[PDB]
Amino acid sequence: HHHHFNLPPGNYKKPKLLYCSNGGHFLRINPAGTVDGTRDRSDQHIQLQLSAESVGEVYIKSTETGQYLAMDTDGLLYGSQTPNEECLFLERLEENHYNTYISKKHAEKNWFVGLKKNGSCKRGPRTHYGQKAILFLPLPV
């Protein structure tokens, strides 16, 4: 293992909004396959269904389009039509409260899902433990 194993509570029964306390944006997977954030709670591309592939390993999928969140070889988040190795994330508890998501494929490099204060996603290499950009709270839809 490259990382700890404190897991968040909650489950995967219902879809969630992934709220980033850094700028208050919800993670959004656009139909074109781009990924960013928005503060508009009425957006139809922020409702995400998570599922556990293995304990602590999840897929994050848009319920509106069926796309899977994924992180590419250069660290950019994208929406994938089919599940692949870039779509698995290590879901962990952080600061005894938040949920963080580490790219399983690049877990040794500590590449997280993260949103900047301006709503743009962070590139894997620019994320790291300790940032506010990587802290999420799953909210009910």
Give the resolution value in Å.
Answer: 1.6
Quickly count: other Cβ atoms within 10 Å of residue 8's Cβ: 17
Where is the binding site for heparin, in residues? 22
Rounded Cα–Cα distance for residues 12 and 80 (Å): 20
Q: What angle do CA 102, 20, 31 make, to 5 degrees?
A: 80
At residue 45, φ and ψ (nearest 5 deg) are -115, 20
**Domains, in order of start, for the chain:** 1-141 (2.80.10.50)
At residue 65, φ and ψ (nearest 5 deg) are -115, -10
Experimental technique: X-ray
Where is the binding site, in residues? 22
